[model samples]
Target: HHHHFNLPPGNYKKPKLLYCSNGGHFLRILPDGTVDGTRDRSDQHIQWQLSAESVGEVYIKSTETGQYLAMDTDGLLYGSQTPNEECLFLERLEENHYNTYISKKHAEKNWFVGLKKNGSCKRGPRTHYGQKAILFLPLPV
Candidate 1:
């Protein structure tokens, strides 16, 4: 079964679970804009709200922290109170109900929000699709 979110202007039909493809760790944002992957999918920090921003981009905000997902100039993922170009992401839908969040930074490489084996989050290249880049598990609502 598929779950969905009916946010304003856009209803994202595929309610996805943001987790680490390496160890099935759920994405969680800390209060200080730190992004990490942990073994707690039910945690409020793991719940995310994807809002429409542009034609092929979306703004990701955490339900628990109320901070928007952002990337730094050094290709690192973080959270910010203000949504800007750094917070814009392009969703790349993959097979088996998974998707990848690619940074929208101009002149930058295809930096994807990835989780390291240590359960930490970082922005890596699209070629890191093994477990770091391949995320987007369906959330169980």
Candidate 2:
């Protein structure tokens, strides 16, 4: 089985538990036999599908630091810039629940990197965003 998803413009910044390896899926749903980012194959592209198992929420940021994404629900703000090097910390609110926070300095740094990488900070002209990752996770309660 396979699944596919095309994000509708709104709230594109949020994370979600797309699917599992078994028969389960989450908020950010996709259809079966769809295309992945690489456009290699539909079946392989369905990372999170209804027929999968044990999946978790996804968060995406850049290791380059200039394209950090800050998004969350339940008031648990978790943000990251360098998805590869930075520390991913979390604060507990209740049972098995936590709120993740990072420094705004990180975000600023990430923004700068993103702009410079895309030639947006050249003062004469600018560019757009590039490819990044979704920093996602699942809490084992």
Candidate 3:
């Protein structure tokens, strides 16, 4: 069994990838309904929920195209889709950052994973940090 590590967008000081369960995946939804893989919490496996349907679900995969997470308008985790379904591949466009294609034309662009709000005095950074980020998905092969 291969362990999956889903990381959020942007660069980190020292990042670790957490593998998704056999039939489960991880996701980090932006405010723009763009879902992406992210694993920045603890080492334990996670199965987060999608409260907002406007966003999409992120996925953790070994391959760049064959494996990824997609969600319906309801923002629920769906089965894996082939790269042919249209996706925005995140390539290491720079030394420590990635970018998505501008024309993947995915089925849905209204689902996103929410970054939980932390308490005062010890917040773990808010989603507003990368509100203007241009992270994107790979185009279907």
Candidate 4:
């Protein structure tokens, strides 16, 4: 089992390891259509183009690979061949002053877009709403 903490009030500071990329890594859409948080910004692989459809909702896809970000039933994160029901996400601004992208299709299931401390994808079932791994800072493209 993962480390479970006694629940604390919201708006806690971002974790040291769960960070914004200055010296940190940026979430990239890899060539294989896989996702990873990376430090290199040289390629066109990192820009996840946005499509606005509703308030607090979005459909994102990578132009370089044309793969849409998707989360499936098993809580795994992967790139989809097309943006289907699972490709949509609820873009919520969390109380901690960072943003969260939760699975709209799996919202009731509480699947979050999570990142590991090593800048890799984390399984949604392993995610926590209050954990810094689920919090992200949107950067300028």
Predictions in order: lDDT:
0.68, 0.22, 0.28, 0.67
Better by lDDT, candidate 3 or 2: 3
Strongest candidate by lDDT: 1
TM-score for every candidate vs. truth? 0.78, 0.18, 0.27, 0.78
Candidate 4 C-alpha lDDT tens digits along 91-127: 6667546667778887876788877768887787888
Q: 55, model 4: CA deviation in Å?
A: 1.5
Tell me the tens digit of each residue's lDDT in model 1 across 51-130. Answer: 76765578888877889988888777788998888998776565445666777773246667777667777655433445
The reply for model 1, stretches above 4 Å from the true place, is 1-16, 106-108, 125-132
The superposed Cα distance between candidate 2 and the true structure at residue 71, in angstroms, equals: 15
Instruction: List, residue by residue over 30-125, the lDDT tens digit for candidate 3.
Output: 333344444444322222211111122222332323334443334333334543232322222321333321112322242222222221111112
**Candidate with more favorable, higher TM-score: 3 or 4:** 4
Which ranges in model 2 have alpha carbons more than 4 Å from their true place?
1-37, 41-105, 111-141
Cα RMSDs, all models: 6.2, 16.5, 13.8, 7.7
Winner on TM-score (1 vs 3): 1
lDDT of 1 at 77: 78
Worst 10 residues of 3 by lDDT: 119-128
